[PDB]
Amino acid sequence: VLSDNDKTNVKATWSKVGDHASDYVAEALERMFFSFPTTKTYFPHFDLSHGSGQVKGHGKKVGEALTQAVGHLDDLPSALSALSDLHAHKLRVDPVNFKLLSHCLLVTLSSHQPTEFTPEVHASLDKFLSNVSTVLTSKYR
Amino acid sequence: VLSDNDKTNVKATWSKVGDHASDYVAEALERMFFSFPTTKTYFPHFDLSHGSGQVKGHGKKVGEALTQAVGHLDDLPSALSALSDLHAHKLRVDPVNFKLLSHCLLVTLSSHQPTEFTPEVHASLDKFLSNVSTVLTSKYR
Amino acid sequence: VNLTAAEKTQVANLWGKVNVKELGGEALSRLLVVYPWTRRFFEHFGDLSTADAVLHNAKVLAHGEKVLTSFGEGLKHLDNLKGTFSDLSELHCDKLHVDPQNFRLLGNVLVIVLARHFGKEFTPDVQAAYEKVVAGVANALAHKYH
Amino acid sequence: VNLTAAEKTQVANLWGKVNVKELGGEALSRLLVVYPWTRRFFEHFGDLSTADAVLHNAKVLAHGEKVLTSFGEGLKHLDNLKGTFSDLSELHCDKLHVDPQNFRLLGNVLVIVLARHFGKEFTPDVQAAYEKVVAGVANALAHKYH
Numbered sequence: 001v002l003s004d005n006d007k008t009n010v011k012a013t014w015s016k017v018g019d020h021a022s023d024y025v026a027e028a029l030e031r032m033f034f035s036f037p038t039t040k041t042y043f044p045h046f047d048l049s050h051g052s053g054q055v056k057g058h059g060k061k062v063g064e065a066l067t068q069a070v071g072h073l074d075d076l077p078s079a080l081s082a083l084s085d086l087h088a089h090k091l092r093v094d095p096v097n098f099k100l101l102s103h104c105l106l107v108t109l110s111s112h113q114p115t116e117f118t119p120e121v122h123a124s125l126d127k128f129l130s131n132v133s134t135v136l137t138s139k140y141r
Numbered sequence: 142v143l144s145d146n147d148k149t150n151v152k153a154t155w156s157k158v159g160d161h162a163s164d165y166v167a168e169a170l171e172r173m174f175f176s177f178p179t180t181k182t183y184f185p186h187f188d189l190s191h192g193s194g195q196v197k198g199h200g201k202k203v204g205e206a207l208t209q210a211v212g213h214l215d216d217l218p219s220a221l222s223a224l225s226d227l228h229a230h231k232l233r234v235d236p237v238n239f240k241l242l243s244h245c246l247l248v249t250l251s252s253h254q255p256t257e258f259t260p261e262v263h264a265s266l267d268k269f270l271s272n273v274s275t276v277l278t279s280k281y282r
Numbered sequence: 283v284n285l286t287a288a289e290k291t292q293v294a295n296l297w298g299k300v301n302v303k304e305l306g307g308e309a310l311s312r313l314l315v316v317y318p319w320t321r322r323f324f325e326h327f328g329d330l331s332t333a334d335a336v337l338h339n340a341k342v343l344a345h346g347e348k349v350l351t352s353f354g355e356g357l358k359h360l361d362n363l364k365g366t367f368s369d370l371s372e373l374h375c376d377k378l379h380v381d382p383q384n385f386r387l388l389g390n391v392l393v394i395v396l397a398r399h400f401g402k403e404f405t406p407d408v409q410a411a412y413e414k415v416v417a418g419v420a421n422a423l424a425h426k427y428h
Numbered sequence: 429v430n431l432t433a434a435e436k437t438q439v440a441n442l443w444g445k446v447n448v449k450e451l452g453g454e455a456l457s458r459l460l461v462v463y464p465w466t467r468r469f470f471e472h473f474g475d476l477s478t479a480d481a482v483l484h485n486a487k488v489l490a491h492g493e494k495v496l497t498s499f500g501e502g503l504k505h506l507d508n509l510k511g512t513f514s515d516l517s518e519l520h521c522d523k524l525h526v527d528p529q530n531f532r533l534l535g536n537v538l539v540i541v542l543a544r545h546f547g548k549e550f551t552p553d554v555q556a557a558y559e560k561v562v563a564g565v566a567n568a569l570a571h572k573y574h
């Protein structure tokens with residue numbers, strides 16, 4: 001997110017996630033569905049059990065969007081425009097739920113890369129996920 | 142706030158507040174202190190009883206900043222820069238408290254200008270006060 | 283959400299002047315206009331595509347009267363809100379999956395509607411008594427999520 | 429925040445491996461680094477001016493061990509959290525005036541610290557049991573504000 005230091009930290013952290021992005025984001029979605037069952041009601045059309053092809057496919061897509069965001073930190077509104085329309089206009093996702101998914105992404109990363117997940121990395125990634133969530137809810141007009 | 146329609150609505154509403162700004166903002170502060178007593182701990186140096194000169198003076202200053210914001214909707218980060226430093230860096234105001242003050246400003250306006258306070262005016266003013274609050278907490282880095 | 287005797291009394295005097303049809307329709311319509319994601323829960327009520335559609339939706343207006351009647355049941359049972367709202371909490375949590383933060387948003391809109399209708403009578407002291415009431419109702423409605 | 433028998437058991441097995449000094453210091457320091465306004469409540473602990481100052485603040489680290497010990501008291505009394513946290517709720521509400529939303533933030537950081545230390549053992553199922561625990565503790569700590 002916005003600051004130069006936070007941008008450096010997020011790009012570093014995301015580079016170390018690297019090819020694990022799709023697996024870590026599927027895991028974060030599972031953690032969200034398990035811990036915060038209200039969030040499952042957005043995915044009645046999915047099998048949400050463990051090992052779900054639908055959850056793994058969707059984790060890949062969400063991870064790709066996060067990777068695009070990490071590459072476009074100065075123009076997230078444009079880079080994420082279609083997704084802002086989808087989440088705010090079409091799906092009407094409650095803003096609280098972005099906090100839940102962000103928290104589960106932090107949990108997932110902390111679990112898998114604990115030495116890398118310092119307090120400074122946690123603060124910078126939290127600010128990134130808040131900035132992405134703000135853009136995705138921007139059409140709340 | 143950002144959208145053209147919301148900007149028009151906020152400027153209209155604030156023009157009708159006009160010279161009542163200082164009184165309405167002092168009233169909103171009193172409503173906040175009375176309804177949400179946790180907020181009083183930011184003003185131990187003030188007399189917070191009704192009729193307080195300190196609360197009336199501060200309401201004038203907060204209303205002036207709101208009037209400046211209504212005139213600078215395309216550059217709130219710059220217009221409010223010093224105030225962002227003050228609230229986030231120096232005073233360390235909890236982001237929840239901006240929601241409380243914003244709510245009490247809406248209550249105050251709805252009470253005093255009820256015919257003017259339509260659902261569309263309420264949505265646009267809510268978005269303005271959220272944008273001002275976001276700028277005032279922007280240094281949460 | 284424990285009320286002084288003076289606050290219990292302020293709550294009742296104003297409530298006896300509330301038109302539950304008009305204010306209930308206004309509170310639920312303002313919730314969907316101001317916080318649009320809340321429209322998700324009501325899509326079965328027909329057109330909510332724009333603020334104008336929300337404001338003219340007969341079912342949203344009718345449902346709002348039911349909601350304010352239910353708040354009135356809380357306001358009149360202030361020592362057993364958990365009990366009063368037990369079954370509704372289960373409906374909102376277990377069947378409707380409404381995030382409980384939204385109960386706070388509806389309370390905020392209801393306080394603003396009361397202020398709009400009561401003007402100068404909705405004093406800072408009267409407001410503070412209602413803030414305790416709405417917070418109590420939200421907490422009680424959230425209970426079967428806790 | 430009602431736990432399955434399997435969840436009660438998962439909670440205990442992991443808790444028996446928690447170093448309360450190391451993890452408590454880490455949880456409170458991460459709260460002040462990640463959510464800087466929370467430093468306001470601790471300014472009497474000395475230098476909090478930068479993240480590095482927070483991370484080296486001996487009093488923040490020592491206080492964090494007290495906080496995690498207190499969470500442990502909740503985790504071991506899951507059927508009377510309100511009772512366990514009654515006096516602390518009064519301290520946090522009446523004397524410290526900490527907004528109760530911050531209790532949720534500290535729970536979020538604590539879950540992240542557990543994940544950091546337990547790795548693959550902190551499974552989605554184990555996490556979900558802890559989320560119920562921290563939510564319960566926050567609710568109980570908020571009670572004497574309700």
Ligand code: HEM
Pocket residue numbers: 039042043058061062065066083087091093097098099101132133136
């Ligand atoms: C960091 C935050 C998020 C990101 C980056 C994100 C990204 C995405 C992307 C890229 C898609 C399109 C997938 C595709 O093209 O097939 C999508 C769809 C979707 N998102 Fe999100 N999302 C986020 C948060 C959320 C949250 C919090 C919810 C609800 C709890 C949610 C619910 C959905 C749903 C229901 C779909 C449609 C999925 C389908 O039918 O396949 N999103 N999201």
Ligand code: HEM
Pocket residue numbers: 180183184199202203206207224228232234238239240242273274277
């Ligand atoms: C719309 C949101 C707000 C606006 C526009 C705003 C504006 C201002 C302004 C203009 C001042 C400087 C006054 C002066 O120069 O004397 C100020 C100071 C201050 N603000 Fe805010 N404020 C906002 C929200 C809040 C909130 C939510 C809190 C805490 C609950 C708060 C606490 C304070 C305090 C403690 C001071 C110092 C007052 C003094 O010592 O005289 N502000 N604010």
Ligand code: HEM
Pocket residue numbers: 320323324345348349352353370373374378380384385386388389419420423
């Ligand atoms: C916090 C105060 C609230 C109160 C007192 C309340 C009360 C009620 C009542 C009395 C009913 C009808 C129950 C029945 O006839 O079985 C109901 C239903 C419902 N509530 Fe709420 N409610 C509250 C908040 C909310 C919020 C914030 C939402 C969503 C944003 C929501 C969504 C619904 C939905 C979707 C229904 C079913 C509507 C239908 O299909 O007819 N409620 N509520």
Ligand code: HEM
Pocket residue numbers: 466469470491494495498499516519520524526530531532534535565566569
């Ligand atoms: C939600 C879980 C929390 C638990 C279990 C908890 C527990 C405790 C305990 C056990 C004490 C020491 C009480 C005593 O010795 O009398 C304490 C004190 C304190 N707590 Fe918390 N606390 C929580 C959250 C928070 C949060 C979120 C904040 C502020 C952001 C906060 C601010 C304080 C402060 C300022 C003290 C007094 C410190 C001193 O001067 O020594 N607490 N808490």
